[model samples]
Target: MHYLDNLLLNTDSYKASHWLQYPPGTDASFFYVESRGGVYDQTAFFGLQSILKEAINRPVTHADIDDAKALLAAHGEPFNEAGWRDIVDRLGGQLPIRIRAVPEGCVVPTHNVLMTIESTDAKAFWVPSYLETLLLRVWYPVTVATVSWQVKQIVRDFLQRTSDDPEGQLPFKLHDFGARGVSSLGSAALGGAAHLVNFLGTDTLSALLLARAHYHTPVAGYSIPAAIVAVVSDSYDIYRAITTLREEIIAVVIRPDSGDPVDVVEQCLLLLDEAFGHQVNGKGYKVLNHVRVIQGDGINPQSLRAILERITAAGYAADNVAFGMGGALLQKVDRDTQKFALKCSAVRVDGAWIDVYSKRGRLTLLRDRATGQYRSALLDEVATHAGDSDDALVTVWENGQMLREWTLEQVRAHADAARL
Candidate 1:
């Protein structure tokens, strides 16, 4: 009778049949995944295995199965009851799962093995197959992170061309204000942490939480408090707002969110100069020395380049202001924007293995002898284009615990590290 019943996973009749199909064969089954579709193509593999560990590490219980069964029947579907019960009965209190992946915050190239999954027990192997939809969706964070990284490169290029302090100013140049623009708290947290991988500036509060949980950080981002002086002519007139709030905090910030870019930024700076004409701070510098301006209405790499160009030409230092990006950084991206996918490259039958792929561009599943782990080696032909293969994958998750963890700072270090 409930209206929302049909919208839940319980009523999703399509996936239930697959629960009975995994743990396939009597020996063992393995599934490996890679990002075949090149999104941003440069390789910053991230955000997979974490979700899998959280979702499937614990055993499915009898009560959980009963509730799922009841919910399915309520929505007029009963195809999954037997499979759910089987998981609870056979898997004990653990998920019977094992995962090997590239370390979080590493550069996973276009054809590297992002990670692989399989059930330790042949009877439970089918459970892993049911996870592709959820597992593949990690493209959100990985893609967002890659986009941010690429954008950092773009900004770095412009900074090298414009700023006197490219190294100092680059980190703060790109700030994420896209928390509210995403669909859920999960999206905000994941996307926000991804942005922090390259820069320290962010306005998404949840990113800090995610950084703390996954990346081992006490605080992931920082912002100025009561530190901005935004004056507008609409309310009490520009003169009144500027002059009145002037001494309250001499240092101020201006953001021109609309209108012709050149005209708005110039006008805002002119008004600030008029309000505090060469005013000196206690340190004997111009009071405007403490002022900052941020321009980010509809911003992209090119638009940011243009803004820095115009302002620096007007004799303002590039560090005098920062950027606050919204839609451009997060909402305007997609999986195709940085092609991402998780595919099965090989499967084991009995005591032997065989290649399970063909040349839609081939990658070899080569395992390390000592570690008993594997990585994807792009076939020699593809390597000429993508690069020679390395053991790109690391064991980030195994059994029920996280093996490798990174902090926001660690990720930023990896992202912005100087490459020779």
Candidate 2:
């Protein structure tokens, strides 16, 4: 078996002991995943489809169960060998769980349900929580996508306010420079693909491959010839490099490597305007001809907004510069970045589903038709009013089958439609 293909061993060690911990007569377990409010007001729901397709869609083999049982027993943890064998023998090796989620790329406000999981087989009450260690990791790509989406909003606001062609330039304003800064190839693939949901420019090559493999897009993103231009300011004066590069006929993007990001970006834009000359667009903002600046250093949301404000105040169009974000784009976030959590909301006992810890029982996400705001409520309450039309959550996976396979184009279109 492949190293990462063993579903039995792909979870936290503590999860191995949870099979015996549920309440007596626990027939089934129901859980929901949500962003309980954090640094951002909203979250761009993404990457869960990829996670399901990549990790959870496969079957559990007999060898996988034997390996897990031996390893867990040797590691001083109890393994539910009977349950594993039952899944393999009786259930045909497919996991008995149903996952319902908001469609990928829907930008819903935080503190609402993003996904829900329920055990389909009565004996698999432990399966929902056992999968938490892997399923909860959806927070990473969701947070990264949220960060990218928020940055796109910042850039889009500035462009609409200052530039004549906001739609023409919004897609290329922020580029992903995060491949080397991430922890692993999987991280690059997941986080990088998340960033591509918002923008068209990316330098993370792994993202394109992941998108093609999972999202079914042959060409999900693009880079430019300007990416190959020489950064000549490292060894010598930046002014001299700019003066020399101005003579070239083709367009060039100058990347300033060091110094205070805001000050250096303003200086580069001013100097580029002087060197290449400028044309005042219909909006009265100056655009430097044949040249642009891409600042790849020290670019967080705050710093990005500061640089855009500085250049706009200095009378340059937002199109005169683009941003290449690295660590902050993919690596600097944690689960708490959006306060993500997956909790048991309901459980089945004696063939009846009961609300576990709260009065809001068997939760489902609903959107107010009049207000256009999303909120969570009791599933029965929603049904009493015949509110399934606005439930927002769609069953995306069940019993090892993908019910929805969203393409990259559909994801991009959904994300782009939720603009501020």
Candidate 3:
């Protein structure tokens, strides 16, 4: 009923008949992740289940189905009568599609199945066969998530190489700033959730909304506000929220888009310490403890190192400052940066299963008896343990229901436990 549902479904009429030509006994279907190459080690399997839950898998009322049928007819094409009848005969109008997928926020390796969709009913195999067109929506968010993770890796490397605290500073290092740069709310939510898979810093409100809706987080991120400062001139003078603030952390944000940050941060430290009079927190770390700094302008590895160098030289801990990265973090990356694909590897006809693959380039027929071998991979207990294991593709969604839900905190914990 939502806009994206109608929009995506409106386009699905064209694919309604594409799969009708498959062999008559083709009673089921399956698709798998073909390759991700080495460019990205993990994917935040995002959006697929959400879209299914919110749109595709929901009950389709008679009115809507009729409208869709009419839409298809108007387009000079109508739904295959058998396929449409199977749904019409079902009560409450379920799509009869069973989807299995890797859990959100779990680190899945390349060359593994990210998801597989097939019909629950023998009569409706073609129902989900053409669903790939809509399901390929995962590519955008998955790519964005991979990009965010890649950037996180680069940041982690630089932090380990330069900062006094790598683990403590890694998450906040890469911020999501590509919300406006994206196309739609779904885009923002999906891409935003992807970015959050790697980092906590984000200016995009929709990213927080996505976490709130799906990840069960009351609060997803934090931000600092600008304040005009004033010092004691005479008679208890305090101008704004800047000076009266004490016993709390103060974040001094500077925009040096191109200016020398070393000079800028050093100058800020001189002013903050002069006014706030550096105090030690309960943890006993004397950092102008009441105040901190964030550098947002031109934040990258080189400039980030330069800023940290000045902070360490000025006898300040790395915790005294943080960096806010924008375009360099999100906008600059693409799917090509990480080769991703969803290809069909197997299909079922009647009671028989076969490894249905092509020899276009090369093929890896890694299927065997006991039914769904790739599905077995989703059930592998050794999954998510081995850093490069294919079994890590744990099922997060199936049969119109979310099989496993991941909170933002839990996602961060899993990520922290891994070697990302």
Candidate 4:
């Protein structure tokens, strides 16, 4: 009886009264979620599958409805008792809603529809909006994934320019150090899993557990013996520790946890090169043989770029360094980071569908045939003028059942296909 599993009580308190507010003749409610354009020009759509499988696939029970009814009454909010009973009785407790979304892991330009939700049953017109509270939280993971992917682009460009094998080195260039910096275990799991969409290195165990449970991957990320160096350096002179560690046969990644990150990284890379010596790769950049620097403190997208540039200018290959991003990677973003919103696009009344907010009746996302860029248009316009041949939206869930399941490998492949 976890409160979070109570579908009737999971949403905002104000939402409890919404069932009584729809127009008298309203038979269906249709809504779409989109990034209205913000920090980034494009978004790496992710985490919807995890949300659908974890949260939305469950059913509403009589116990949940009774609990919500008493709580809402005492809290002075109206509860939809009959609506809950009707769903439980007629649909065997399954929600009568359909959700269509762009395939998870696709990198789509902003201002395009990412998902659309509609009540599949006429009596459940309030269902779609009721679930908005849970569904809209997809913003967190999607933003994390988008930010991580954008950072990957930056790392890829630097590696391609300054390293011998960019593709081989790219996956481990950016590591997730965000678990503790986030708000909760759930945040860590969601944001951590999102970061893995772009890279394979992580210290967040919760993310791996989530990926295993939801995405059907036995292993989603990898880690190395890197945390030991931070403690070892603190117990002795940083330079002496580096010199002592140079003799070890295994690779040691030294993490500088303080000071101006770019300057610290530049200094560490130069010192590591002096201690372990280096080889000039075919790309004409020096890569240390046994030592590398991972700058974890004071890092963001801007700081990471600066660190990479500083070291590259110092004649070190991008292979000599990697980044560990924490707060900036997972906790700093919000729905506004991508300006995400879910708005009612259309509603049904007297057995007819009417466009609500925009003249574009019942929106659908499509890729431009000539340009290969994504855009939104009226569903009818696409069906009549262009057909749905190129529509990116696919039905992922309907009536409390999963319609499609995406694996972590599939998500990574789709995300990796995007070029800067």
lDDT for every model?
0.61, 0.86, 0.59, 0.85
Query: Candidate 3 clashing pairs?
Result: none
Q: Estimate, for each residue in 1-420, the C-alpha lDDT of model 4 and write its tens digit.
A: 255777788788998898888888899988999998899999999999888777765677899888999989999998889989999999989989889998888899888899998889988888998988989999999999999999999999999999989999999888899888999998898899999999999989999999999999999999886443432242124556532443454537777666787887887777666666899999899999877777777878899899888888888999988888888898999999999998888888899988876434588789766666788877776765774348878998888889887899999998999876
Model 4 is weakest, by summed lDDT over 10 consecutive residues, at: 227-236
User: Per-residue CA lDDT of candidate 3, range 1-420, in tens?
Assistant: 254444225445557766656777786666655445656655555556556555554555655666666777787765665556556666345666656665665455566566666567776666665666667667776767666665566656545554556787787766666666676666677677777877777788887887787777877875544452222121112112343545553544333334465656665665666666675433343366355566665666567767666665665555556666655554655555557666665567677766665312112222233332332342323435433333434455554556766677777665555455
TM-score against truth, every candidate: 0.76, 0.95, 0.72, 0.95
Q: In model 4, which residue pairs have backbone atoms overlapping below 3 Å?
A: none
- lDDT of model 3 at residue 212? 86
Error of 4 at 268 (Å): 1.0
**RMSD score of candidate 3 (Å):** 7.2
> Candidate 2, residue 86: CA error in Å?
0.8
- For candidate 3, give the lDDT of residue 405: 61
After superposition, candidate 3 runs with Cα above 4 Å error: 1-3, 7-14, 76-78, 161-165, 227-251, 259-321, 327-334, 358-391
Against the true structure, whose lDDT is highest? 2
TM-score of 1: 0.76
